[PDB]
Ligand binder design. Structure first.
Ligand SMILES: *[B]([O])([O])[C]([C][C]([C])[C])[N]C(=O)C1=[C]N([C][C][N]C(=O)C2=C(O[C])C(O[C])=C(O[C])[C]=[C]2)N=N1
Ligand code: NA
Ligand code: NA
Ligand code: NA
Lengths: 244, 229, 230, 241, 245, 236, 218, 199
């Protein structure tokens, strides 16, 4: 439609808020980010497209620490993604202040999702051009992974993908039996899927960002160390020849 | 928010959103109000789309305080804002003055609120005309108030679908010292002109106002008046 | 129809763009920086002999050591001149010293893009005014230009107004860096007489100078009539 | 369908007296691609909707349109999921705040009225759109017995003997008005099975346990019970004949 | 937001305010409201647009509003806008009285409302109040007074004037027949009914009031339907008596 | 076109044209280059003169003892965003008695400049910065933009004809980390004049340098100050 | 002031004296301290007379608003909550000591509400300057589930003990029985205490300087 | 006032007196000072009644909505922090001490003190005016690993000993026993109080 697509305070005749849909297209044009729920935690992998070799490694970091126990992986307009991380950091900080313990991930997902939803109702502001995945592990709650989109919908996921290769990444995840496998295993298979769905012909070269949270890390969202990342990058390259 | 009027003057010199709001009233489910010598009647069509609708739940004919009542034609949600506000305005008078609010004065206060949304920032006016029954010194009162925020004291009138037919029907058939028995019967006959279906205790709603304040009539009380038609 | 804080595809604010366009309508003014002093000259553009000539103050005293010449919307300028005048005496109050010509110009340059609609108390549009500051501080005699964007820079010589384009070509040929003040004063009145479609005289213009020894002085009828010669 | 000014872009009147932006919020309920049904028994009240899990990679527990507002009250949403969650958060706030201010359990009509009055503000003020969603509340009133209460994006609300909302609303309300006219002893079994068969025969699907989700309140257990897939399986096989 | 803005408070290219002019066109459709000054009093006479068999007649007036003890006014335009403005006029009259302990002078009360009406034309982005008012009053400075105002927030003092339907036709008719310094309230009442006979004659359709000073205190009273109907028959007889001769 | 005027209006392409228009303010603005070694961080700026009579435009600004910047865009947004950095630095020296980490300062710029891109009747900051600074993690070059995105860098260039500079820098990356100060400044100067045409080249009037490292605070070099650095290699 | 309350089998009875004192001088002999809140909710006024007056006025209006909206007879827990949270915000400066009594859906209910915003649900209570005399009478002879006749007699005896015993308290016993079927407002239920007078001055004994007569004529 | 909470294997016992004083006058001799915050979380009210109730109402309101937002029963650490933060924020203005205790699926039976906006988990705690007189007894008589019945005995003995000595404490002993199974409320009357030396 045209005429009805300028403001988030305006429905179209078909019953659609095109400003929210256009914010989701900025995510669909952005690069692929994925994450899978293991037995003993959650792992994140991101296709970070290098615009120039002039930039340092660990610049434009699309993986973030929201809390000590929670990890955020983003895809879309990156400025909006960082401000969403700042919202989630403060929102998690408010829970610790109010209730004296670590925020549950479903609650953290819901409270930040309603922040995202608030920007889809008014002419005065625009939606966030960003989908992101929140992931966590705990003693009692266990492994949990949630994804939020520009509209403000929050669902829980065993496996999830957002970006260029949204559909293409998901059919590769469906092959893996994530429920039985562990975080130690899944880092190889997450690194594999990024290398598959990466278009070498269209796009430039890329850096694989890997983070995780699990029993391995004592429910703490850390980066995957250079020992394990480079093992998984090696596994990705050599097993790409095995199906080519 | 938006700090500018959505209702504005056209080259002809007409506040277009008010006349468009009157079209929303004019295409609403019809409503009638009649002033007897000893009392006041308010009646309206409550014909919902299915038998699935619980008839006892929500009401068109609503009280404001113990001596004033209310009914509408047009937009239902807009009406409920005016009911809540009118109820507050009644108590704000009673708290200050320790006297039951005059019906004229309640209409004037709600009129001022209805006028507010024809000028203030970022808001359309109400798609509602109200009919306000009452009892003050020792005598009946009936008032209309329409989306403009203008108000008119009526002996009798109609609203909604076939309001032109209801008004002419009433003009010839209304007498200026009717009994409240007869006026309740007249109000149902005014609705039966514009009706599409067989009438019942459920699918219409009536309230009355007299010496002992305002109340909504029960289904069985209505059923007695429906028996002799 | 669009907002005041809207970029063009070229990458610049429409209202700032159009504020530069407003200075072309304004009457021309020249300032020349020399080692012996900064002179400042401007045309009054008198539309009637009934209009009192002395009450068109287009060069004004900011302080005893600084002046400012203006072109464009004359009313818009008086807001900025007063804010500069306030800033200098606020600085004198706090620090017991004179401001530099750069420091004053910067303070006025901070106000240039302080406009907008939503999130405001405040200005709707920019100031459609170019200012030629000219004074003498601890770093010798200095002349500074400012435009509606907020861009400000030191100038050896510069002009602004309707014949800014025409006068700058004449300044290129005429200007020499080791010249005297009295040569620079007479240079301006030569360059002004050409561009004015009215004829140059003591009532039709304002001149003013600032030296190291002497304060800001605006020239009288008698002092202008002596220079008039050339 | 006459139009002038910005009447299709913002919530202001058309020449006919309609609000086109309100009407478009009703079309936005259908975009979810789901239909909800709600039914009132003699001693209970039940809600049912499609628990559509196309992706196996979803956690099917977190996929739900049934929500707990208080202990004694729960609702089914239908429409835009972001709007639906947002309207549920506000229902929880207003319900809790009622118990703080007034010291008793909010009744089901007043919670539904409160949300409907909030929806009207969007219906009148141009600055924001209406929420493209539809809340159907259920709960046991102490005086009045069990209650079913819908409210629209327009700001309407009403009590119902049974109701539906979503894609196949008109077919579901057509099915329910046929069955309500016939006499039944409206027990917990009668009320639940009418809701599932209404949603089944309208959509023309024999449901499995994972393909639906059921919420309910009885006279004996008035706390908001969301039935498990095992409990759903018993009612489906009861309709084997 | 910027797309949806009507922009009520701006100059059009000609050098004028559209919503102010368009509001004065609304007044030109509304009922014929006039006022006439005299030596021994002031009057207002208005066309009564609320005319039906089934109307109740609660209030002492319909278009006429009392403001202070020594002042009153009538209106022409949107009646809801008039109820706001008249309420505010009454507030101003008492705000002056609380402050000084004298009645507000008539020009001062009119300027106070007209400063508010002008604000709605200059700022706020709001539509103006679509009402012209005719004011009557007495004060210790200028005595018997008549004022006109309009949606712009502009006012003037008049000996006799009109607003509403057939405004210009009524003023030109008043310019013929009004004699300055020589008019009493009885002669003014004859001219009021003469002009309303041209523009609009039953007494339900007419509504008159007379401000006068009797025994050191101002007396504002609406005329009853017996007083109006006898004045209508006096016009009909005086019109017919000239027609024969 | 419909999606050009307001920052809140998403295009059907999935783009915000008022950001992308604000990016063009940097590009039409003058050229400037930034790079770092193991020990130092250097900024080099081609100062654009208005006319040949008027003095050259100030392109490198001071923020703290440990941070300074070079600009490209609207000078008022440059000065506004400079004062924000100066103040957040001042807050950190006041509160903690310790210089503000450069990555943390750069994060606050991104947070700040993002705010108006999402709000109606507001605009992005029409200015791109190259931010040189030294801290506990050694020297840094950071980039910022109107889009509120920021980049950690080995080196960078921005402004008019800055593609030429970026091509030069991408070749000599591994050289920069090993270089001494004089070799690192000379590298940045060669990247800058690659943006210029063959007719005109670097002089003491039209070049400014800004240097910070382990030994030195953020010093700025403009006129005779620059003369030591230029006199080394000058051909092509 | 002596005000008191009492829960019995079919309902609640609320008692109050009629004296209103200004310092140590009797201003009013006959005044109603039992105020209307709802049809089957009444409230006794003690402490600062204006604060007792205006809070009970205000909550009555709030219950009328609440009842009209709900379409239900109001709960006695709701009046207590509204009073508390009003009174708590003002930190006891609104000095209204109140006994709130009524019947609703959940049975007969009596609440003591103090001016700082504390409350107590009770079967019997007393407040005001002669609370102790009335509360002593209640402790001596209260039992659970009294008759309508015995409760009136006990509650009259409680308020009477204050009337005689407390210098602040005086005059008649007003009362209010709130059964299930409505509320019976027994004003002047008792009169514990029972002249010559006549000081007829002749017209003209008072000397007069000015006289003005303003006739009115309707 | 005398209040007391005690911790054990899979639950907490929680006890108060029943006297609301106004100097030498007893305003209410039968006041329940154990107010519910959630289904399995109580608090023992102490100090200013108006202050103590208002915090309990606000904590109950906050914890009701917090519980529904998680789709779970709130933690006792959460309810202890809700009471802590209110008491701390308005510590100058309020003059009350709300001892909070209950049961969790996570950490089980637990007792927290919130004296003047602090927070501390103890195996037992005591509060109010009458707690002064029984610090010796609770130190003497407490040993770890008590049953529900041993805790109910100990809470009754301590509060009865205080009620004997403290003028501001008196009336009946109200008792609450919170476990996974539920909440057992019980009222030990003034008739059947455990006798000690009282001369
Ligand atoms: B308990 O803490 O005694 C009890 C607990 C409640 C939860 C029911 N609280 C009360 O009984 C109580 C007392 N008051 C107000 C009366 N104040 C005092 O008694 C008081 C006094 O006065 C004797 C004094 O000194 C005179 C002090 O010391 C400054 C403190 C309190 N409200 N509730
Ligand atoms: Na709206
Ligand atoms: Na006494
Ligand atoms: Na004791």
């Amino acid at each position: 439609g045209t005429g009805y697509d300028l403001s988030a305070s305006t429905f179209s005749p078909d019953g659609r808020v095109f400003q929210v849909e256009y914010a989701m297209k900025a995510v669909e044009n952005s690069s692929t980010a994925i994450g899978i729920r293991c037995k003993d935690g959650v792992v994140f992998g991101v296709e970070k497209l290098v615009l120039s070799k002039l930039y340092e490694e660990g610049s434009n970091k699309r993986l973030f620490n929201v809390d000590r126990h929670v990890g955020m992986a983003v895809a879309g307009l990156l400025a909006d993604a960082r401000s969403l991380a700042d919202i989630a950091r403060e929102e998690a900080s408010n829970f610790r202040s109010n209730f004296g313990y670590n925020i549950p991930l479903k609650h953290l997902a819901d409270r930040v999702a309603m922040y995202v939803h608030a920007y889809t109702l008014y002419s005065a502001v625009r939606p966030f051009g960003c989908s992101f995945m929140l992931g966590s592990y705990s003693v009692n709650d266990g492994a949990q992974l949630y994804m939020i989109d520009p509209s403000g919908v929050s669902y829980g996921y065993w496996g999830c993908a957002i970006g260029k290769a949204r559909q293409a990444a998901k059919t590769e995840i469906e092959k893996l039996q994530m429920k039985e496998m562990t975080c130690r295993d899944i880092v190889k298979e997450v690194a594999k899927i990024i290398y598959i769905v990466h278009d070498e012909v269209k796009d430039k070269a890329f850096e694989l960002e890997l983070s995780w949270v699990g029993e391995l890390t004592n429910g703490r969202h850390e980066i995957v160390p250079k020992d394990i990342r480079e093992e998984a990058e090696k596994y990705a390259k050599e097993s790409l020849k095995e199906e080519d | 928010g938006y700090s500018f009027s959505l209702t504005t003057f056209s080259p002809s010199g007409k506040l277009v959103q008010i006349e468009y709001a009157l079209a929303a009233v004019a295409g609403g489910a019809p409503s009638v109000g009649i002033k007897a010598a000893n009392g006041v009647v308010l009646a309206t069509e409550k014909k919902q789309k299915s038998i699935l609708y619980d008839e006892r739940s929500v009401h068109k004919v609503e009280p404001i305080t113990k001596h004033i009542g209310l009914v509408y034609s047009g937009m239902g949600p807009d009406y409920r804002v005016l009911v809540h506000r009118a109820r507050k305005l009644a108590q704000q008078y009673y708290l200050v003055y320790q006297e039951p609010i005059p019906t004229a004065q309640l209409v004037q206060r709600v009129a001022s609120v209805m006028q507010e949304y024809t000028q203030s920032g970022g808001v359309r006016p109400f798609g509602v005309s109200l009919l306000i029954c009452g009892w003050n010194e020792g005598r009946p009162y009936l008032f209309q108030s329409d989306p403009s925020g203008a108000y008119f004291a009526w002996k009798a009138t109609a609203m909604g679908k076939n309001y032109v037919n209801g008004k002419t029907f009433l003009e010839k058939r209304y007498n200026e010292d009717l009994e409240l028995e007869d006026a309740i019967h007249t109000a149902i006959l005014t609705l039966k002109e514009s009706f599409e279906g067989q009438m019942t205790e459920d699918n219409i709603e009536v309230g009355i106002c007299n010496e002992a304040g305002f109340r909504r009539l029960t289904p069985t009380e209505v059923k007695d008046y429906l028996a002799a038609i | 129809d669009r907002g005041v804080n809207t970029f063009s595809p070229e990458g610049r604010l429409f209202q700032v763009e159009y504020a530069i366009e407003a200075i072309k309508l304004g009457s021309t003014a020249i300032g020349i920086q020399t080692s012996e002093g900064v002179c400042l000259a401007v045309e009054k553009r008198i539309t009637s002999p009934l209009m009192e000539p002395s009450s068109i103050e287009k060069i004004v005293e900011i302080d005893a050591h600084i002046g400012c010449a203006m072109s464009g919307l004359i009313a818009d300028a008086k807001t900025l001149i007063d804010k500069a005048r306030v800033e200098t005496q606020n600085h004198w109050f706090t620090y017991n010293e004179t401001m530099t010509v750069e420091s004053v110009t910067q303070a006025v340059s901070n106000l240039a893009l302080q406009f907008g609609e939503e999130d405001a108390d405040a200005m709707s549009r920019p100031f459609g005014v170019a200012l030629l500051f000219g004074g003498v501080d601890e770093k010798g005699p200095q002349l500074f230009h400012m435009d509606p964007s907020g861009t400000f820079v030191q100038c050896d010589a510069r002009a602004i107004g309707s014949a800014s384009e025409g006068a700058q070509s004449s300044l290129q040929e005429v200007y020499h860096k080791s010249m005297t003040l009295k040569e620079a004063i007479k240079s301006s009145l030569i360059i002004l007489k050409q561009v004015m479609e009215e004829k140059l005289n003591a009532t039709n213009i304002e001149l003013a100078t600032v030296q190291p020894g002497q304060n800001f002085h605006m020239f009288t009828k008698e002092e202008l009539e002596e220079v008039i010669k050339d | 369908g006459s139009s002038a000014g910005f009447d299709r872009h913002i919530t202001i009147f058309s020449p006919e007296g309609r609000l086109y932006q309100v009407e478009y919020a009703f079309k936005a309920i259908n975009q979810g691609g789901l239909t909800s049904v709600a039914v009132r028994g003699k001693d209970c009240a039940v809600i049912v909707t499609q628990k559509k899990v196309p992706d196996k990679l979803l956690d099917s527990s977190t996929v739900t349109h049934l929500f707990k507002i208080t202990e004694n009250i729960g609702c089914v949403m239908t429409g835009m999921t972001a709007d639906s969650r947002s309207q549920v958060q506000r229902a929880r706030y207003e319900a809790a705040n009622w118990k703080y201010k007034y010291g008793y359990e909010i009744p089901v009509d007043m919670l539904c009225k409160r949300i409907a009055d909030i929806s009207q503000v969007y219906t009148q003020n141009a600055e924001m759109r209406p929420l493209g969603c539809c809340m159907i509340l259920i709960g046991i009133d102490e005086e009045q017995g069990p209650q079913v209460y819908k409210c629209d994006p327009a700001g309407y609300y009403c009590g119902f003997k049974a109701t539906a909302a979503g894609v196949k609303q008109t077919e579901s309300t057509s099915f329910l008005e046929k069955k309500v006219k016939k006499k039944f002893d409206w027990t917990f079994e009668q009320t639940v099975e009418t809701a599932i068969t209404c949603l089944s025969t309208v959509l023309s699907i024999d449901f499995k346990p994972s393909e639906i989700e059921v919420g309910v309140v009885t006279v004996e257990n008035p706390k908001f019970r969301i039935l498990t897939e095992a409990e759903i399986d018993a009612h489906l096989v009861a309709l084997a004949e | 937001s910027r797309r949806y803005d009507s922009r009520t408070t701006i100059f059009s290219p000609e050098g004028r305010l559209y919503q102010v002019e368009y509001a004065m066109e609304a007044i030109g459709h509304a009922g014929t409201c006039l006022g006439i000054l005299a030596n021994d009093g002031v009057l207002l006479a208005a066309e009564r647009r609320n005319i039906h068999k089934l109307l109740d007649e609660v209030f002492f007036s319909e278009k006429i509003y009392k403001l202070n003890e020594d002042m009153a006014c009538s209106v022409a335009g949107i009646t809801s806008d008039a109820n706001v403005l008249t309420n505010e006029l009454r507030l101003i009259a008492q705000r002056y009285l609380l402050q000084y302990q004298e009645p507000i002078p008539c020009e001062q009360l009119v300027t106070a409302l007209c400063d508010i009406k002008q604000a709605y034309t200059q700022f706020g982005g709001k539509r103006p109040f679509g009402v012209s008012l005719l004011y009557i009053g007495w004060d210790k400075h200028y005595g018997f007074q008549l004022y006109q105002s309009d949606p712009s927030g502009n006012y003037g003092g008049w000996k006799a004037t009109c607003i509403g339907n057939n405004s210009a036709a009524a003023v030109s008719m008043l310019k013929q027949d009004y004699k300055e310094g020589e008019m009493t309230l009885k002669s003014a009442l004859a001219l009021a009914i003469k002009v309303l006979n041209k523009t609009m004659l039953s007494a339900e359709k007419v509504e008159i009031a007379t401000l006068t000073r009797e025994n050191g205190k101002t007396v504002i009273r609406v005329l009853k339907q017996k007083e109006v109907e006898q004045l209508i028959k006096k016009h009909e007889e005086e019109e017919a008596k000239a027609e024969r001769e | 076109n419909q999606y050009d005027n307001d920052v809140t209006v998403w295009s059907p392409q999935g783009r915000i044209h008022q950001i992308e228009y604000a990016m063009e303010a940097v590009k039409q603005g003058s050229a400037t280059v930034g790079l770092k070694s193991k020990t130092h961080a250097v900024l080099v700026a081609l100062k654009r003169a208005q006319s040949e009579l008027a003095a050259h435009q100030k392109k490198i600004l001071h923020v703290d003892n440990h941070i300074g910047i070079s600009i490209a865009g609207l000078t008022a947004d440059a000065r506004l965003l400079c004062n924000f950095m100066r103040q957040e630095c001042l807050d950190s020296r006041f509160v903690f008695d310790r210089p503000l980490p450069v990555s943390r300062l750069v994060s606050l710029i991104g947070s700040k400049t993002q705010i108006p891109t999402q709000r109606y009747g507001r605009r992005p900051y029409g200015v791109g910065l190259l931010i040189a600074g030294y801290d506990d993690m050694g020297p840094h070059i950071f980039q910022t933009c109107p889009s509120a995105n920021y980049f950690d860098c080995r080196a960078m260039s921005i402004g008019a004809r800055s593609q030429s500079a970026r091509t030069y820098l991408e070749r000599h990356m591994s050289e920069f980390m090993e270089c001494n100060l004089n070799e690192l400044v000379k590298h940045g100067l060669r990247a800058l004049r690659e943006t210029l045409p063959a007719e005109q080249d670097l002089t003491t009037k039209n070049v400014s340098i800004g240097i910070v490292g382990k030994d030195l605070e953020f010093t700025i070099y403009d006129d005779d100050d620059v003369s030591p650095f230029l006199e080394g290699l000058e051909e092509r | 002031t002596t005000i008191a309350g009492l829960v019995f089998q079919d309902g609640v009875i609320l008692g109050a004296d009629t004296r209103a004192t200004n310092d140590s001088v009797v201003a009013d002999k006959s005044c109603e301290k039992i105020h209307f809140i709802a049809p089957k909710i009444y409230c006794c006024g003690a402490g600062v007379a204006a604060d007792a007056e205006m809070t009970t006025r205000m909550v009555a209006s709030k219950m009328e608003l609440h009842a009209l909206s709900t379409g239900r007879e109001p709960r006695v827990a709701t009046v207590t909550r509204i009073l508390r949270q009003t009174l708590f915000r003002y930190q006891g400066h609104v000095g209204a000591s109140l006994i709130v009594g009524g019947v609703d859906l959940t049975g007969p209910q009596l609440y003591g509400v103090h001016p700082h915003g504390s409350y107590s649900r009770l079967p019997f209570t007393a407040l005001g300057s002669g609370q102790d005399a009335a509360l002593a009478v209640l402790e001596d002879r209260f039992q659970p589930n009294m008759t309508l006749e015995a409760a009136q007699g006990l509650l009259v005896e409680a308020v009477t003990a204050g009337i005689l015993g407390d210098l602040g308290s005086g005059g008649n016993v007003d009362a209010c029985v709130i059964t299930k079927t409505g509320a019976k407002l027994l004003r002047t239920l008792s009169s514990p205490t029972e002249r010559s007078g006549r000081y007829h001055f002749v017209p003209g004994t008072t000397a007069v300087l000015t006289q003005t007569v303003k006739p009115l004529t309707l | 006032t005398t209040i007391m909470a005690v911790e054990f294997d899979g639950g907490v016992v929680m006890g108060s007196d029943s006297r609301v004083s106004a100097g030498e006058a007893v305003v209410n001799r039968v006041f329940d000072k154990l107010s519910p915050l959630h289904e399995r979380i109580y608090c023992a009210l102490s100090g200013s009644a108006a202050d103590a109730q208002a915090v309990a109402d606000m904590a109950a309101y906050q914890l009701e909505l917090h519980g529904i937002e998680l789709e779970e029963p709130p933690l006792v650490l959460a309810a202890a922090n809700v009471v802590r933060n209110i008491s701390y924020k308005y510590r100058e203005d309020l003059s009350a001490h709300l001892m909070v205790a209950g049961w969790d699926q996570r950490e089980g039976g637990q007792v927290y003190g919130t004296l003047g906006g602090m927070l501390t988990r103890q195996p037992f705690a005591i509060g109010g005016s009458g707690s002064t007189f029984i610090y010796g007894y609770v130190d003497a008589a407490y040993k770890p690993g008590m049953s529900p019945e041993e805790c109910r005995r100990f809470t009754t003995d301590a509060i009865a000993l205080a009620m004997s000595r403290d003028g501001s404490s008196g009336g009946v002993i109200y008792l609450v026993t919170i476990t996974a199974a539920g909440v057992d409320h019980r009222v030990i009357l003034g008739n059947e109080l455990p006798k000690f030396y009282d001369e």
